[PDB]
Amino acid sequence: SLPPDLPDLDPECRELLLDFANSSAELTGCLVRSARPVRLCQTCYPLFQQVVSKMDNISRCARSLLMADRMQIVVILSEFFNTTWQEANCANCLTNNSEELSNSTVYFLNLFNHTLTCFEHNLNYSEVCKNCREAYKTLSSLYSEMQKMNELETHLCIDVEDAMNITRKLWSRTFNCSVPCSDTVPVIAVSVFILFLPVVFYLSSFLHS
Amino acid sequence: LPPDLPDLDPECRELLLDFANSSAELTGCLVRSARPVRLCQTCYPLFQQVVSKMDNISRCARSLLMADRMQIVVILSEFFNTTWQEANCANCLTNNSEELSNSTVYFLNLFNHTLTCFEHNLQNYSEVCKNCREAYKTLSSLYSEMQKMNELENHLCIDVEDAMNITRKLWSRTFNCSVPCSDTVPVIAVSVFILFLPVVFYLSSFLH
Amino acid sequence: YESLDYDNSENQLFLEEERRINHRTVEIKRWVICALIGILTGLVACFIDIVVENLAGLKYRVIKGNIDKFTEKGGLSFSLLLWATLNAAFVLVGSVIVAFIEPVAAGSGIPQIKCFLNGVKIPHVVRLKTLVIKVSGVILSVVGGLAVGKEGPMIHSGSVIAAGISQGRSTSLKRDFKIFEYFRRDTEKRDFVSAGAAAGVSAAFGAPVGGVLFSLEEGASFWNQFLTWRIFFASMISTFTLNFVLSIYHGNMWDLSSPGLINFGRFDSEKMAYTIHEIPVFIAMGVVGGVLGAVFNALNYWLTMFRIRYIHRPCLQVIEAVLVAAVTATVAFVLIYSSRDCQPLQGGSMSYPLQLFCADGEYNSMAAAFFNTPEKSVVSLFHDPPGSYNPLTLGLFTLVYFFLACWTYGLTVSAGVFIPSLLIGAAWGRLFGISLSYLTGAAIWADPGKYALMGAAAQLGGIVRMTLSLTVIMMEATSNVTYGFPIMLVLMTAKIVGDVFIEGLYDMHIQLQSVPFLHWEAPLTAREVMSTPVTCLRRREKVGVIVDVLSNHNGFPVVEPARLQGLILRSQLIVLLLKDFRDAYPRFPERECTMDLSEFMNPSPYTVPQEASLPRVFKLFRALGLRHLVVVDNRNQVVGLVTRKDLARY
Amino acid sequence: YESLDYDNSENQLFLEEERRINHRTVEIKRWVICALIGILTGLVACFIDIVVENLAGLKYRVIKGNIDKFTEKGGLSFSLLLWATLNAAFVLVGSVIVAFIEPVAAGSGIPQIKCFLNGVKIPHVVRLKTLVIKVSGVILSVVGGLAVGKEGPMIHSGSVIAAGISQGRSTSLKRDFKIFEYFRRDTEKRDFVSAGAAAGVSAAFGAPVGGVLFSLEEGASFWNQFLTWRIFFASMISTFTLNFVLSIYHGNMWDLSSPGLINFGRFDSEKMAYTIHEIPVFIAMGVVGGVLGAVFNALNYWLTMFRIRYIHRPCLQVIEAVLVAAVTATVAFVLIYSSRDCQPLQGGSMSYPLQLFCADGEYNSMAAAFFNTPEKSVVSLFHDPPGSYNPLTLGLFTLVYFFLACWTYGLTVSAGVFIPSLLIGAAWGRLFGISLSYLTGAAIWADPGKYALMGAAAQLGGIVRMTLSLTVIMMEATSNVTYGFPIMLVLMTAKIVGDVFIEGLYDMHIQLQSVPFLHWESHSLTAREVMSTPVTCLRRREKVGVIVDVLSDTASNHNGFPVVEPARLQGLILRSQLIVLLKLKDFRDAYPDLSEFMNPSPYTVPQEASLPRVFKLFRALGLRHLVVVDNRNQVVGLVTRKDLARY
């Protein structure tokens, strides 16, 4: 006979709470599974959209769940999900309607798969530096193109940045592919001559005056 | 291809598919016991297994924890620790953090008596304020005892603050229990006497 | 009211004893004494802060413990008589010692120190007894619940420390302490008092540069580089000592969070930012604080004028402070009792949360305007989030504290009106922010904590009409440089709009005593404002004339027609009747012989010609620390003498 | 090197000119003028900052687009030629207009403003041609890659504005404006150059009281209340104008986050707090700062003594200014090229990152010490996470930048030395905090970003030995009052240790030119040995013709002649007034019996007055004449400020 929501909630209002509890518990699972081989923005995208949907479904018993104690679990869990989704920058892929991966990053991931299978097919790592540079250069050029295009609408979405981080770590170290760059005797010849001009100027200005 | 650059070795993979099972269950428990706030007493063992499975792998601590610019396994246990410290769930637990404290188990037993006396002493609410007031006074005095005992160490546990919030909001409003306080005539009679002394001092010293 | 000769004698014995020290440990001793001034002023500030904190804690714990007992029982009338008596017992003790022992320790010492740095010597201003009585009296006046502050009396306390330890002689314990022996002139002691008043401002607010500009406003002299660098050294030592000891009292020692006795906080939270379009709004606030400051000063002028005539016995002005101390408690309890709004905890926003008739988790919020320090109430009227204050309780606390602070200031207790003025201003400035955030809707530029700062500056500038140093104290105390541009507009307007009605609080109380008080500049030639019965003196003067001239004209020029040769003082003639004149420096005491004062007189006194204008004779007399200025003819004939009482009339 | 009469004559025509006004608009016009001085100085700071920001951003993209084009093909020596050629082509223009057109714009104008406020008029210090050459010389020497800063020559620039709009005319264009005829009295003109120098300091550093204390120290006069309050009003409007216009240029108008041209950022980071057990550590940084400031001053003095003779034609000055700018390019390239370490580009910390020989995500760390404005380098050496600087990189950068800054100061470009001093001091000061974060094992009190602040003040106080206004600039730029005590002890120690070797930099460049400069402060020497005995006195009703002979000596310059009538003193008459009378608003239009015209009440001292009593009266009132008399008013000697400078 007690009043509603004060010792115990409404019957229809805990349906919303349990239904939000089902899907915000699935996202934490899919966010820790798709975490170290970083496939985060391309796997957790249908599960982030329904957690932010069920959060707006309890805003149109809002006072019964969201604002009723000093530590608001549903509100801060949704804030955690948003600040993780805005730090990963998963809106830089999933182009404009959050419904499919963008048609500039599916091209990157296809080319990334092609570059890694060209690495592992051609296998000291002498034959990897030759014969396989053409894929690595176009992958790096595509990445820098998307990176300079994203600024005019500071990080790309974490999938493509981690794929490029992996292939930079694999090309730079563990294979040690590097250009020779035999340009040091013209540099030292130009820099010794310009450093010799103050000696000439101050000495001839001292003598012939 | 070497390990840890494309993929993960399966032992350190299985130390990630295990921590994923413990965070999903903990988030489920947190939201299911969110609003009728049974937080610190339902899933304390789930928080214990998450804080154990984090240190199971912190001591491949580099193949999982420091390998990205966004460290998921790191910043999610910081969420769990920040939520567990803002709740002050250490007050509801023992020194061993293995069971409920001896004080909280005495509060939450006494709270059940007050909520079963409210709903029974009821047919207005001019009968609830009588014959039930002795429970509210001892519950509130016990709360103010616990609060200063916690102050002796340096908010209480959120599990008992929400219970006291519910019973104060159930007593003060919705029942409108109050005290009469026939005390507004002697205060007016004294504060009209003291404010009259300056107009006696300034007028006596002006004449004489 | 005598003067001090800040111009040095420069006679034959000064020139001889200037040798054998240049033939340099005098400059090192000055930096040593300035470091001592800074350390001692910071330590006295710490002692006041700690004792006031603990005694007011004991009083509020006793008073709160008796309200909470009598609430359900029902004897709340007997709890009003406890707080009407606990206030009237600390104020009774702290006003017997001011009325019966030292009435120069009454109020804030800022008019007396402000008259000292011009040169007027109010007779008992820098003794040790004044320091003891003013420190213990400001403690008993703050604990006993008057509507006063405690930062104002820090300037007088620091300058009394500075005049005390610079001489190296107590003259109260009957001691000598043969250490210093050289800084017993009036040209050294005024500079030390200037450094001490600066260190007082620096510990009072946490603003050393504002203390330097305070001590440069008063004592408007020539620029002395090394003097101001010592003054800045003493102010830095003062702020550091206060902060370092108050850190190791709170048991942290690392944060150093308290530079002064009031700490405004950090104004950089992105809600604090102002914009150019509300620069007119601030000007409007400067008008309102100029009107209200004139009302404060007018109501306080017509009450001090009542009290000088009718309430001037020492027994009868102890009884007035007891009644004001009881009435502040009565009005506070009446406003606490009859109020309605209640409030839960905000994490130490009340410090003594009084539940009176609230709902058992809530607390009475009129009792939080009272039962706090005025410092914490000002710090919380700044920096709080919007929606924190009810405009009825805040506007009814504002209306009452105005008259309680206006009726308290002329009392015979040690007190101050900086923190009352800052609390009156921060309250209607916070109300101004509420009506702006109500007219514009929930805006972002309509932040009420931004307008509480401008209201505090406007009220403090309207009451205490003071611009150049107070702006720097405000701009340094909030640690934001972009705030000085609105604040100095607000302090400009509040001066102008104030000065059309009434004078200013520290200036009106200088005028209400018959004090000379040279101002900044002239409001006429030197022939009009001189004094022709000068009664000059011969170099080879037959004594017996000297004991008849001396037995009102402390300075005598030395002539011979009669050509000017120099000046002689009253004190040096008594000593003759350079270390002997300085040995007898504190408290100067037939007939036929001849006195040859050719090696004791000032050989080159400053002279103005007879045709020289009044802004020229006033410029030299005010900048150079002069007390006599000779007016000569064209044949160097002395006619007329210009002293301070000649220049302070017009 | 002509003097400046700061005290009015207050003669008869002065009194009838004052009575008609006071029977009040001539005080409200000072506030209008000081508000305009503040607005205009802030706008000149805005122009300099925006143009240097856009022009240097066009140069480092040409160079980065050339280095990152030849780094995989080969041929990096072309990029070295390009960078030396661009620096040479900017400094050629930037020094060919100082050396040939107006050579008084050379350096920062701070010794010229100190000599002006001390009352010595160097022949072009306040003239519109000097303003255009200095503002465009700063831009062309800061863009042109020299090791210079743009904050020094804001103090001079604003002063040139302050003496321009007060005397409201244009002596260059011969255009007149009857607006401020009253303010042409040379008493007012030294009052406005104080306000303008103060507003220049406040728009330079975001320090309004440091500007006011700068004007109070230099120009050490009697305390004038309304003057000081006008000066403070000018400084506040200067820093508000700069902050407002740069915020509307950057976007986000309600973000007033740029008070000065260098913005140190706030030190409330709770790990920047000091304690008492590291105060004698700060006394040791003052000694290191003083020794290094003395080495800087010694090497620069021998450069300037090599450059007074042997390099004094303007053509050799232009060629030397070019060859310094080509060497600072190649020294920077040889340090960038041979550098091994490189960082993975954390945030907005490089602004032109060079992946020269690094691995596609890493960008070179030496290349960010160059390629980057020294304001951003100094601000990033403060409040930065530890482990951010390789000590070999800062060691090499601090080693070569100490000498490139010492070799650039005496050149004929417009240049400052505040910002290279702060960069040297913040650079080795950060190394000292790194070496304490190694010994103590990364303790909390051994934070390296805090010691960069004390090294910066130590080096700036050691090179240019000003205190009490440099201290207050540091407190308002750090926005932390508790730091004012260690910064004061550091600056005091650095001045005391530096003064036992060599004088300050500004005092040195003042005294190398033969100026009559007075100091702030010998009682055994009376005023009898200071006077000049040949005194040509005029009479009250003196016949014309010997006035022409007195003014036409051409063997002894004199600008002050006492009027006598025994010969008892009656007053003092000038040269310029007397030339006007040989052909009080007919005396101000010519401004760039004689009983009614003479100063009737001149300041006199007797002949037995001591020299500190004479020097106190002469400096604090701003006199250029002081008549020494006998026991009566017979004139014996006269003081014209060469005699106080020579002792």
Ligand SMILES: *[C@@H]1O[C@H](CO)[C@@H](O[C@@H]2O[C@H](CO)[C@@H](O)[C@H](O)[C@H]2NC(C)=O)[C@H](O)[C@H]1NC(C)=O
């Ligand atoms: C007791 O319950 C009240 C409401 O039932 C809590 O008040 C909420 O507090 C949060 C933040 O403290 C606000 O954002 C909400 O808007 C408040 N709710 C309402 C309805 O105003 C209060 O915090 C609870 N107290 C405790 C100790 O848990």
Ligand SMILES: *[C@@H]1O[C@H](CO)[C@@H](O[C@@H]2O[C@H](CO)[C@@H](O)[C@H](O)[C@H]2NC(C)=O)[C@H](O)[C@H]1NC(C)=O
């Ligand atoms: C590329 O991978 C490296 C690791 O291989 C990342 O470096 C980590 O950066 C974070 C924060 O910047 C540190 O807390 C870690 O300790 C670093 N890892 C190591 C092994 O040191 C780097 O952030 C990655 N970059 C991107 C864009 O993802």
Ligand SMILES: [Cl-]
């Ligand atoms: Cl006060």
Ligand SMILES: [Cl-]
């Ligand atoms: Cl006061």
Ligand SMILES: [Cl-]
């Ligand atoms: Cl500079």
Ligand SMILES: [Cl-]
């Ligand atoms: Cl410079």
